[PDB]
């Protein structure tokens, strides 16, 4: 309803949404940049976090405590694990989990942090709303499991290891599961809305330089239209 | 000087120091527990974080913003990588870095987060003071590089891989480098004072059940004596 939080890692991933604001205004704390304004008639706070799990958890903790948002949306790029996906397609989270956490010496599941749940669940009412939006705009999309870690997956060897341990995973990136862990600790609803920049294989670095802009346009176009429904 | 922050992961690692406080008092926020009181004549705030990088970064962010500490000390247990160390010995950090971060597809160093330094440095004046303390108490100790990750190292295969990539590393655990990254972002001085529970090999899980208590006694005895010098 009344206050919407929006979070992305890199300048290329937040610049499109920041230029659409009327009456923009800017605030600095430690390394984090916050932009307050009006978008499609609702009040929002846009946040630039930095890369990886620790930078995303510091930015999320400050967002919640300073601005008191009703929901949090994560935007940006990612790598495809499902063979039916192409560059540009939209990615909507159902559940999220770590591919690089191992406390099995103590009997926990592969991917699980000691004393926490196996996976974190995105908000049902937000999933339902955004699937209807992607139809109206005519943009190809898919709902599924996203996995996170502190590495860039850029080889066939790395990719094959992840698909054998988690056969239902659809895509891979560096912040979503850290932002979801933080929202669980404070009880705030959350969803991921990203798009494909690369296929996470021996071509991943050359694909990412060519297609980072294209994935930010797809992703930002869907988030703009969803805010106008909330 | 006037306000000292103390942070440990598990109940076994904070219980000894909490029982030595006079006029104890307790406060709750999300999953985090804080205990305010007097220790050896100085005011302190004791923090129980939970396990791994995201839980340690949420607890550190709240500590700094709510309590305004002058310095932060990390206490608890860890696994030995150096062949000259035994169960019970004290571990003092010089620098700290990740063993599980890989963005080399973009030309960064092994262990480095994109856009951040290669390693984080502990406070010189705190290192000098604590080395003098460990002599007076007659407890065997060593100063060196500590490395962190979201896995428990409990096999010869895991251990050999870490020692080849980082040949000067002395020990391994799950929170110290996340707490150091947070203190760098806000400019607060920091040091690690832990002790050995296991040798990070095929016996690591059985050693940890036997010797967790012994490492918390060693570690807590050194932190009590350092606070009385500050």
In order of their start, the domains of chain B are: 1-230 (3.40.50.1580)
**Hey, what are A53's tokens?**
């799990």
Q: Does A37 touch chain B (CB under 8 A)?
A: no
Measured distance CA(B173)–CA(B204) in Å, rounded: 12
Cβ atoms < 10 Å from Cβ of B200: 25
Active site residue A213: no
Residue B12 annotated as binding? no
For residue A58, give the nearest of B57, B150, B205 by CB distance. Answer: B57
Give the Cα separation of B9 and A228 in Å (integer): 43
Q: Which residues contact A187 (CB under 8 A, 6 or more apart)?
A: none
Q: Please classify residue B179 by burial: count the beta carbons closer than 10 Å to its beta carbon, then call 0-12 exposed, 13-18 middle and 19+ buried.
A: buried
CA A70 distance to own-chain centroid: 18
If DSSP states are collapsed to H, E and C, what string results for A168-214?
Answer: CEEEEECCHHHHHHHHHHHCCCEEEEEEEEECCCCCHHHHHHHHHHH
- Total length of chain A: 230
Is B153 in contact with B200 (CB distance < 8 Å)?
yes
For residues A13 and A200, the answer to whether their CB atoms sit within 8 Å is no
- Nearest CA to CA, how far is B150 from chain A (Å)? 5
Task: Count how many residues are written for chain B.
Answer: 230
B146 within 8 A of B91, measured Cβ to Cβ: yes
CA distance readout (Å), A65 to A186, B10, B146, B176, B229: 10, 25, 32, 24, 35
Whether B52 sits inside 8 A of A113 (CB atoms) is yes
Annotated resolution, angstroms: 2.0
Q: Please name the method used to determine this structure.
A: X-ray
Structure tokens at B159: 């251990």
Which of B30, B54, B105 lies closest to A154 in CB terms?
B105
Distance CA A219, CA A88 (A): 9
How far from B97 is each of A55, A155, B148, B162, CA to CA, in Å?
Answer: 15, 24, 7, 12
Give the one of A50, A100, A106 whose C-beta lies nearest to B205's C-beta.
A106
Give me the residue label for tokens 């407890």: B139
Instruction: Give the distance from residue A120's alpha carbon to the nearest chain B alpha carbon, in angstroms.
Output: 14
Residues of B in contact with A108 (CB under 8 A): none
CB contact under 8 A, B58 and A182: yes
Residue to test with chain B: of A31, A50, A54, most B Cβ within 10 A? A54
Query: In this complex, is the C-beta atom of B182 within 8 Å of any C-beta atom belonging to chain A?
Result: yes
In three-state secondary structure terms, A102 is strand
Nearest to B83 by CA among B171, B209, B194: B171
Which residues neighbour A21 within 8 Å (Cβ) at sequence distance 6 or greater? A35, A37, A38, A39, A44, A46
d(C-alpha A17, C-alpha A9), whole Å: 13
Contacts of A66 in chain B (CB under 8 A): none
**CB of A113 within 8 Å of any CB in chain B?**
yes
| CA nearest neighbour of B57 among B205, B157, B180, B223 | B180
**Whether residue A198 lies in the annotated active site:** yes
Kindly provide the b/e burial profile for residues B131-153, where b requires at least 16 CB atoms within 10 angstroms of the residue's own CB. eebbeeeebebbebbbbbbbbbb
Contact residues on chain A for B115, CB-CB shorter than 8 A: 50-51
B54 reaches A (C-beta below 8 A)? yes
Across chain A, the runs of DSSP E, i.e. the strands, are 4-8, 22-29, 32-39, 42-48, 71-74, 77-80, 90-98, 120-121, 141-148, 169-173, 190-198
Taking CA atoms, A10 is separated from A13, A16, B133, in Å, by: 5, 12, 45
């Amino acid at each position: 309803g009344s206050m919407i939080g929006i979070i992305g890692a890199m300048e290329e991933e937040v610049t499109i949404l920041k230029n659409k604001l009327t009456q923009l205004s800017e605030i600095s704390v430690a390394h984090v940049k916050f932009y307050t304004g009006i978008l499609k008639d609702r009040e929002v706070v846009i946040t630039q976090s930095g890369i990886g799990k620790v930078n995303a958890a510091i930015s999320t903790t400050l967002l919640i405590n300073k601005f008191k948002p009703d929901v949090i949306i994560n935007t940006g790029s990612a790598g495809a694990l499902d063979e039916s996906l192409n560059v540009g397609d939209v990615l909507i989270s159902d559940d999220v989990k770590y591919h690089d956490a191992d406390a099995t010496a103590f009997g926990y599941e592969y991917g699980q942090i000691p004393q926490m749940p196996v996976a974190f669940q995105s908000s049902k009412p937000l999933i339902e709303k955004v699937s209807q939006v992607v139809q109206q705009q005519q943009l190809t999309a898919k709902v599924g499991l996203i996995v996170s870690g502190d590495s860039f997956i850029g080889s066939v060897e790395q990719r094959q290891k992840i698909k054998k341990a988690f056969p239902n995973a659809m895509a891979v990136e560096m912040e979503a599961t850290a932002i979801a862990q933080t929202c669980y600790q404070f009880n705030v609803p959350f969803v991921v809305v990203r798009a494909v920049s690369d296929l996470a294989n021996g071509e991943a670095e050359m694909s990412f330089e060519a297609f980072l802009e294209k994935a930010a346009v797809s992703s930002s176009q869907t988030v703009e239209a969803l805010v106008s429904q909330l």
